[PDB]
Amino acid sequence: SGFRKMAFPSGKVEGCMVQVTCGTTTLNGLWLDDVVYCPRHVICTSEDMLNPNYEDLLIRKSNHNFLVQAGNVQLRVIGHSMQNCVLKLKVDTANPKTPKYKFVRIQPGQTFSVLACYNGSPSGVYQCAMRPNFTIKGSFLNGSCGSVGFNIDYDCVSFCYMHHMELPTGVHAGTDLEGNFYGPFVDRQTAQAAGTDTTITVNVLAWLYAAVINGDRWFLNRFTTTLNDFNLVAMKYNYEPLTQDHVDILGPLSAQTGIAVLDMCASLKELLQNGMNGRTILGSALLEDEFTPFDVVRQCSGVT
Amino acid sequence: SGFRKMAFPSGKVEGCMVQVTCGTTTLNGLWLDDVVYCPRHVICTSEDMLNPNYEDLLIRKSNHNFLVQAGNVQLRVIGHSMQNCVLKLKVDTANPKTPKYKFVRIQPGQTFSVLACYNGSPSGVYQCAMRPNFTIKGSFLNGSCGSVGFNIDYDCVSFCYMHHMELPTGVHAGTDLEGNFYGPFVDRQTAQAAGTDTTITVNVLAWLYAAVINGDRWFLNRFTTTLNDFNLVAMKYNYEPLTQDHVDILGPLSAQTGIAVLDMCASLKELLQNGMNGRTILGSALLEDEFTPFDVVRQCSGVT
Numbered sequence: 001s002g003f004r005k006m007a008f009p010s011g012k013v014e015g016c017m018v019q020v021t022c023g024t025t026t027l028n029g030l031w032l033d034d035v036v037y038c039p040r041h042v043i044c045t046s047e048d049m050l051n052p053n054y055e056d057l058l059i060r061k062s063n064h065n066f067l068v069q070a071g072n073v074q075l076r077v078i079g080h081s082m083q084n085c086v087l088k089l090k091v092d093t094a095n096p097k098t099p100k101y102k103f104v105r106i107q108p109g110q111t112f113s114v115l116a117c118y119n120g121s122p123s124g125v126y127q128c129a130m131r132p133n134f135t136i137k138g139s140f141l142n143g144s145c146g147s148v149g150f151n152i153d154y155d156c157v158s159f160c161y162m163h164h165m166e167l168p169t170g171v172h173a174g175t176d177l178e179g180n181f182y183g184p185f186v187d188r189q190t191a192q193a194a195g196t197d198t199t200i201t202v203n204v205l206a207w208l209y210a211a212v213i214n215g216d217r218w219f220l221n222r223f224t225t226t227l228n229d230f231n232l233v234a235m236k237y238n239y240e241p242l243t244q245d246h247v248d249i250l251g252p253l254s255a256q257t258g259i260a261v262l263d264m265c266a267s268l269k270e271l272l273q274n275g276m277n278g279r280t281i282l283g284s285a286l287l288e289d290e291f292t293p294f295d296v297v298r299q300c301s302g303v304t
Numbered sequence: 305s306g307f308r309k310m311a312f313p314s315g316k317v318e319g320c321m322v323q324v325t326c327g328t329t330t331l332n333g334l335w336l337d338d339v340v341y342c343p344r345h346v347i348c349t350s351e352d353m354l355n356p357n358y359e360d361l362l363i364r365k366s367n368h369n370f371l372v373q374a375g376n377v378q379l380r381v382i383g384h385s386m387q388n389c390v391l392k393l394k395v396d397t398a399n400p401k402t403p404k405y406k407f408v409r410i411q412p413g414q415t416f417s418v419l420a421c422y423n424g425s426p427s428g429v430y431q432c433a434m435r436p437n438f439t440i441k442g443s444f445l446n447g448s449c450g451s452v453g454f455n456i457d458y459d460c461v462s463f464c465y466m467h468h469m470e471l472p473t474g475v476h477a478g479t480d481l482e483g484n485f486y487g488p489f490v491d492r493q494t495a496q497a498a499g500t501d502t503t504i505t506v507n508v509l510a511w512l513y514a515a516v517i518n519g520d521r522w523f524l525n526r527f528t529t530t531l532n533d534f535n536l537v538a539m540k541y542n543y544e545p546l547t548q549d550h551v552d553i554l555g556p557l558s559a560q561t562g563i564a565v566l567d568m569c570a571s572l573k574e575l576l577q578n579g580m581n582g583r584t585i586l587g588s589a590l591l592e593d594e595f596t597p598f599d600v601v602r603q604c605s606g607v608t
């Protein structure tokens with residue numbers, strides 16, 4: 001019993017972190033096999049931050065200008081290339097600690113763990129969701145660029161995020177491991193609209209099922225609703241519209257608890273319309289949307 | 305910017321986790337040097353759970369009855385001893401992945417990371433506080449016993465907790481690494497009073513400083529208070545009395561923000577008396593007490 005915002009064990013990712021320095025900028029890199037991946041803005045100086053011409057900036061750099069250090073040992077760079085917003089530095093040594101891994105592009109509403117790093121050294125690990133507007137609400141300071149987000153399925157690490165930027169609003173933006181930004185963002189020091197965010201409805205319902213499993217049940221009521229009626233409420237409260245695909249993904253939780261998905265939607269409708277009345281659910285005084293239905297099943301069943 | 309409930313990177317601890325089986329019970333062990341530490345209740349069966357005679361139960365076991373497996377490899381047990389509520393199994397091989405470590409007894413109100421494990425395999429990592437009543441509100445299922453809590457200072461892991469029990473109330477209890485329970489608990493399947501808990505005042509103040517540093521400032525007011533006046537409010541709201549020692553530990557945060565500790569106490573007094581009025585602080589709709597002043601400084605300065 002108990003339900004916590006749990007991150008994946010970070011060990012397999014810690015063994016991939018390196019420091020990358022180019023000129024006067026230092027950030028983190030991810031060393032997998034004989035390639036080090038890092039944000040391309042490592043080649044920038046302050047003057048070329050408002051609108052860097054990355055192609056021109058990279059043309060002034062040679063393999064020997066990319067200083068890559070894995071703890072105390074220096075890696076020899078034998079190639080460099082830019083793919084979208086990431087640099088790929090080919091090194092002469094494959095990382096002996098490379099885990100089984102994949103590069104994935106996650107969907108908005110999905111969750112992942114972040115290993116925050118500075119100077120190639122791990123600082124901490126936390127779980128978060130990719131917002132529907134493709135930003136993340138992380139904890140990142142200057143020097144954290146190149147820190148990565150990931151999920152782990154048994155012995156395989158699926159890398160889904162690399163940190164690049166803090167928007168002027170204090171929220172974070174980054175790319176997949178092929179250097180493609182999530183959302184409309186560009187790697188420039190400019191104000192950029194993130195767009196309307198919404199609450200991840202399917203996740204809030206999953207967390208309400210986690211609450212019932214762990215004994216917080218005060219929010220269960222005598223009511224039911226329909227997808228149409230619930231979606232009118234979701235529209236009013238800036239929640240993502242619930243679809244049959246979301247209802248289907250909540251199937252295992254509905255089967256485990258015996259609470260029909262539309263019945264849980266009626267409880268969520270009442271909490272949206274009436275608030276929590278000074279009460280808490282799983283130690284939270286707001287409706288939590290950073291646990292997917294898969295997260296709830298995993299945590300409630302002890303998957304390792 | 306951004307503030308998250310961050311856990312320490314778990315890698316150094318993952319390399320110490322082993323599975324321990326005795327008879328029909330399997331739980332986790334911590335392999336440091338040539339010793340494996342695990343909860344002594346691994347030697348129990350269901351019949352002897354209400355009140356086990358651990359001395360008698362252990363007398364029926366020999367070194368060869370303790371099956372210790374580190375991933376796929378079996379460790380040879382050459383000795384066994386019970387120290388308080390923990391068993392120490394001496395093995396013939398020192399763990400090659402033993403980090404620099406210490407065993408510490410943490411104080412109530414201090415925080416630590418937990419690496420939840422099942423069958424010797426890491427499942428997830430989360431940060432929590434040792435409650436003032438010496439319980440933890442964790443996320444643990446059957447099989448998680450032997451999972452440990454720790455802090456990391458550079459390359460040294462300070463192990464402070466080993467999980468033993470879930471009380472009938474769903475909260476958790478465990479020991480230091482010498483097998484001494486935190487709190488009044490005993491390792492028996494019996495209802496046990498945990499005692500009145502309180503909110504960790506110094507931590508809530510630290511988190512309010514973290515909020516101001518990250519831009520959430522709506523709760524700052526034109527008022528001040530005294531330790532005496534604030535403590536009358538803390539008494540009414542079941543908060544720990546604030547002392548000069550707590551004020552002194554908040555010194556760095558008060559210096560960084562320019563907000564006098566008693567001025568922040570006046571903001572906390574107003575939030576206690578008036579509530580949040582439907583607003584949030586660092587994404588929370590309640591007053592958070594799981595960040596120590598040290599945690600706030602570390603996260604706000606990027607310590608690795």
Ligand SMILES: Cc1ccncc1-n1ccn(-c2cccc(Cl)c2)c1=O
Pocket residue numbers: 041044049140141142143144145164165166167186187188189190305
């Ligand atoms: C200062 C900071 C804090 C947290 N995460 C990231 C940062 N951070 C460090 C550099 N950049 C940056 C901003 C815009 C464009 C480009 Cl190419 C880089 C940034 O946002």
Ligand SMILES: Cc1ccncc1-n1ccn(-c2cccc(Cl)c2)c1=O
Pocket residue numbers: 001345348353444445446447448449468469470471490491492493494
């Ligand atoms: C079932 C469970 C779930 C989460 N954490 C722990 C457990 N859990 C597994 C065994 N015990 C136990 C209870 C009382 C006394 C003793 Cl010696 C052992 C327990 O509490």
